[PDB]
Structures are given as structure tokens and as C-alpha cells.
Symmetry: C2
Subunit: 49 residues, 2 copies
């Protein structure tokens, strides 16, 4: 208790477990981040907002 918080920068804090997703076919990332790379060396966002 107390030492179990998970804080994003402006939103309600969670506590003691969550999930994180690392998918490879989000449109905004296709457009900007990933132009010269492939499905084995890619770059993705962990923020879903």
C-alpha cells in the first residue's frame, strides 16, 4: 500500500497492475514514425489517446 501507484501525466492514477500494448499497425505510426523500416525493427506508441 502506498508504494504501488501508476501515474500518467494528467489522468487518474491506477494501482498495482495494468497492461501495455505494442502493436505494429496503427495508422498514425505508419504515416510518421515508420517509413524506412519493417515489421521486425519497428517503432510504436504506448499511448492510446
Amino acid at each position: 500500500e502506498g508504494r504501488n501507484s501508476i501515474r500518467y501525466s494528467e489522468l487518474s492514477p491506477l494501482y498495482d497492475t495494468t497492461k501495455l500494448y505494442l502493436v505494429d499497425n496503427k495508422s498514425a505510426d505508419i504515416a510518421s514514425l515508420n517509413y524506412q523500416n519493417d515489421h521486425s525493427n519497428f517503432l510504436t506508441t504506448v499511448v492510446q489517446n
Copy 2:
């Protein structure tokens, strides 16, 4: 201290002062809430989301 928090239902809490707005010409409220009333007896949203 401690007894000064302001809590919305899913967002970061504020502390010790804020503002609240009561305007009368928001589109969504024009459409739904206010159809049979006027500018002197009106109905508005305090949530801006």
C-alpha cells in the same frame, strides 16, 4: 491541506480553487436540451469534454 481536493470522476484531482462556466450557446445543448425554452430560463452543461 488534505481537505481541499476537487474530484471529477476519472481525471486528475485539482486543489483549492478552479472555475466553472455557465454559457448558453453550446451547439450540443442547443440541439438536445433546449428546444422549448429561451435565454432567460435555460439549461446548460458544466462539463467541457
